[PDB]
Design a protein around this motif. Structure first.
Motif, PDB file in Angstrom:
ATOM      1  N   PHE A 163       0.820  -1.192   0.000  1.00  0.00           N
ATOM      2  CA  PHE A 163       0.000   0.000   0.000  1.00  0.00           C
ATOM      3  C   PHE A 163       0.867   1.260   0.000  1.00  0.00           C
ATOM      4  O   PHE A 163       0.541   2.244  -0.672  1.00  0.00           O
ATOM      5  CB  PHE A 163      -0.969   0.030   1.186  1.00  0.00           C
ATOM      6  N   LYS A 164       1.967   1.202   0.691  1.00  0.00           N
ATOM      7  CA  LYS A 164       2.884   2.310   0.773  1.00  0.00           C
ATOM      8  C   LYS A 164       3.613   2.562  -0.513  1.00  0.00           C
ATOM      9  O   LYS A 164       3.805   3.662  -0.886  1.00  0.00           O
ATOM     10  CB  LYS A 164       3.889   2.015   1.829  1.00  0.00           C
ATOM     11  N   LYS A 165       3.999   1.491  -1.171  1.00  0.00           N
ATOM     12  CA  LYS A 165       4.569   1.593  -2.489  1.00  0.00           C
ATOM     13  C   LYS A 165       3.607   2.244  -3.480  1.00  0.00           C
ATOM     14  O   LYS A 165       3.974   3.079  -4.231  1.00  0.00           O
ATOM     15  CB  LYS A 165       4.988   0.256  -2.982  1.00  0.00           C
ATOM     16  N   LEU A 166       2.355   1.852  -3.446  1.00  0.00           N
ATOM     17  CA  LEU A 166       1.361   2.433  -4.340  1.00  0.00           C
ATOM     18  C   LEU A 166       1.186   3.922  -4.047  1.00  0.00           C
ATOM     19  O   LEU A 166       0.960   4.728  -4.955  1.00  0.00           O
ATOM     20  CB  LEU A 166       0.021   1.717  -4.214  1.00  0.00           C
ATOM     21  N   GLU A 167       1.280   4.285  -2.772  1.00  0.00           N
ATOM     22  CA  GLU A 167       1.210   5.694  -2.393  1.00  0.00           C
ATOM     23  C   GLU A 167       2.472   6.433  -2.821  1.00  0.00           C
ATOM     24  O   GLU A 167       2.412   7.595  -3.225  1.00  0.00           O
ATOM     25  CB  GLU A 167       0.996   5.853  -0.887  1.00  0.00           C
ATOM     26  N   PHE A 222      -8.596  -0.693   1.587  1.00  0.00           N
ATOM     27  CA  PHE A 222      -7.424  -1.476   1.948  1.00  0.00           C
ATOM     28  C   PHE A 222      -7.563  -2.029   3.364  1.00  0.00           C
ATOM     29  O   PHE A 222      -7.375  -3.228   3.596  1.00  0.00           O
ATOM     30  CB  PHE A 222      -6.150  -0.637   1.822  1.00  0.00           C
ATOM     31  N   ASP A 223      -7.897  -1.152   4.281  1.00  0.00           N
ATOM     32  CA  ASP A 223      -8.040  -1.497   5.670  1.00  0.00           C
ATOM     33  C   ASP A 223      -9.106  -2.565   5.912  1.00  0.00           C
ATOM     34  O   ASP A 223      -8.954  -3.365   6.738  1.00  0.00           O
ATOM     35  CB  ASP A 223      -8.273  -0.259   6.537  1.00  0.00           C
ATOM     36  N   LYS A 224     -10.180  -2.516   5.175  1.00  0.00           N
ATOM     37  CA  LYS A 224     -11.272  -3.428   5.349  1.00  0.00           C
ATOM     38  C   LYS A 224     -11.012  -4.808   4.738  1.00  0.00           C
ATOM     39  O   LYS A 224     -11.602  -5.743   5.116  1.00  0.00           O
ATOM     40  CB  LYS A 224     -12.540  -2.873   4.735  1.00  0.00           C
ATOM     41  N   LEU A 225     -10.166  -4.844   3.749  1.00  0.00           N
ATOM     42  CA  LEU A 225      -9.919  -6.093   3.020  1.00  0.00           C
ATOM     43  C   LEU A 225      -8.610  -6.787   3.364  1.00  0.00           C
ATOM     44  O   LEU A 225      -8.455  -7.970   3.093  1.00  0.00           O
ATOM     45  CB  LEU A 225      -9.993  -5.871   1.501  1.00  0.00           C
ATOM     46  N   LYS A 226      -7.666  -6.063   3.961  1.00  0.00           N
ATOM     47  CA  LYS A 226      -6.288  -6.560   4.049  1.00  0.00           C
ATOM     48  C   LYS A 226      -6.091  -7.842   4.856  1.00  0.00           C
ATOM     49  O   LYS A 226      -5.151  -8.585   4.609  1.00  0.00           O
ATOM     50  CB  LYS A 226      -5.329  -5.458   4.537  1.00  0.00           C
ATOM     51  N   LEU A 255      -7.869   1.310  -4.677  1.00  0.00           N
ATOM     52  CA  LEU A 255      -7.408   0.811  -3.392  1.00  0.00           C
ATOM     53  C   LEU A 255      -7.135   1.983  -2.445  1.00  0.00           C
ATOM     54  O   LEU A 255      -5.980   2.315  -2.126  1.00  0.00           O
ATOM     55  CB  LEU A 255      -6.179  -0.075  -3.536  1.00  0.00           C
ATOM     56  N   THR A 256      -8.220   2.621  -2.023  1.00  0.00           N
ATOM     57  CA  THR A 256      -8.156   3.685  -1.030  1.00  0.00           C
ATOM     58  C   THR A 256      -7.754   3.097   0.318  1.00  0.00           C
ATOM     59  O   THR A 256      -7.820   1.874   0.529  1.00  0.00           O
ATOM     60  CB  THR A 256      -9.520   4.353  -0.873  1.00  0.00           C
ATOM     61  N   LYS A 257      -7.342   3.955   1.243  1.00  0.00           N
ATOM     62  CA  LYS A 257      -6.982   3.459   2.564  1.00  0.00           C
ATOM     63  C   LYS A 257      -8.162   2.733   3.212  1.00  0.00           C
ATOM     64  O   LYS A 257      -7.974   1.716   3.880  1.00  0.00           O
ATOM     65  CB  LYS A 257      -6.478   4.591   3.462  1.00  0.00           C
TER      66      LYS A 257
END
Ligand SMILES: NC(=[NH2+])NCCC[C@H](N)C(=O)O
Length: 348
Positions: free
Chosen positions: A14-18, A36-40, A31-33
């Protein structure tokens, strides 16, 4: 759900994508935060995680889409990421729509779009199928790869008439056979970085294979990206002949091998770009005038829902739409669009 180590790699992803401020993939876009948070930490009953979905798009930032489905369940479990990506990619396939049930329509009614053979060097229609009972590449065991190969090889090798031909497993294939298949453009290679990072090529070449008919108008790839990639092709522009052959073959295969299918998404495929009909009807076509300005060709193609790809002023031009229309409608869009493109070429 997902193992702690997986969640850790997900956080880094996720950080790489950011980090990639330049990134244009649908993965990055959706893939919003929050999502991401809900699915990770979620995991399918077969064990597929969000990492098994997005790894390819994390590793290859230049992805257009950047996700794949590791099993059928992933489409449902990770719907909050899949659904908007599917909506965005498959333009016009709306939230309220469902992909129609299979309908090849009147397959013989399609015309030769270039009877003189002045523009179209060849015409091809392909589809893809996943086999019912088997998940997609990253969730397949070695044994499943081999069992699938055995079933497909046995089915294809029992085809008769026009479809009669030869199955060649990739495993142990000699250089001489490789050259022969390459010369016919029948051979596929181990998957590229996008497929590698999706874990789509485990155990390669186990369970991978190619089939073609004697006439060299019918080609099947086994376990390349999808379980089955099924292709009918011939020189010239007779789309009717090509589509009839394809549908005949797909129907014959289905008698022995049932396909994975979804009420909303249509035929399920490893990449969501291939959902719905899965159909890619194309010509390899020479349009020297319209190709003088590549941007103009692109604009005109898009107007008639066609997509332009590589394949010397020779283009692979195919139907752009896969979802929210029948197989008949998709082939018809390609037919009508190519007819119109040829007229434009002649008149320029
Ligand atoms: N062969 C394909 N499925 N191509 C479409 C997807 C390719 C790659 N995963 C991307 O996002 O750009």
């Amino acid at each position: 759900m997902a193992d702690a180590a997986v969640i850790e790699k997900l956080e880094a992803g996720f950080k790489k994508l950011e980090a990639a401020t330049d990134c244009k993939s649908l993965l990055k876009k959706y893939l919003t935060k929050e999502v991401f948070d809900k699915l990770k930490d979620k995991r399918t009953s077969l064990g597929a995680t969000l990492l098994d979905v997005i790894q390819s798009g994390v590793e290859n930032l230049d992805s257009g889409v950047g996700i794949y489905a590791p099993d059928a369940e992933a489409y449902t479990l990770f719907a909050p990421l899949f659904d908007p990506i599917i909506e965005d990619y498959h333009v016009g396939f709306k939230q309220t729509d469902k992909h129609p049930n299979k309908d090849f329509g009147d397959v013989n009614s399609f015309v030769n779009v270039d009877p003189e053979g002045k523009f179209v060097i060849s015409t091809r229609v392909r589809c893809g199928r996943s086999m019912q009972g088997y998940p997609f590449n990253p969730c397949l065991t070695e044994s499943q790869y081999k069992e699938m190969e055995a079933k497909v090889s046995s089915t294809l090798s029992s085809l008769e008439g026009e479809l009669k031909g030869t199955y060649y497993p990739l495993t142990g294939m000699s250089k001489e056979v490789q050259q022969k298949l390459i010369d016919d453009h029948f051979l596929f290679k181990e998957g590229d970085r996008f497929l590698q990072a999706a874990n789509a090529c485990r155990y390669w070449p186990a369970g991978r294979g190619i089939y073609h008919n004697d006439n060299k108008t019918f080609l099947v790839w086994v376990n390349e990206e999808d379980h089955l990639r099924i292709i009918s092709m011939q020189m010239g522009g007779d789309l009717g002949q090509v589509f009839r052959r394809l549908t005949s073959a797909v129907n014959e295969i289905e008698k022995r091998i049932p396909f994975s299918h979804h009420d909303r998404l249509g035929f399920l495929t490893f990449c969501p770009t291939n959902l719905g009909t899965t159909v890619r009807a194309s010509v390899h076509i020479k349009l020297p005038k319209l190709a003088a300005n590549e941007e103009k060709l692109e604009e005109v193609a898009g107007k008639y829902n066609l997509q332009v790809r590589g394949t010397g002023g020779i283009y692979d031009i195919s139907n752009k739409r896969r979802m929210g229309l029948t197989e008949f409608q998709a082939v018809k869009e390609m037919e009508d669009g190519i007819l119109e493109l040829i007229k434009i070429e002649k008149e320029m």
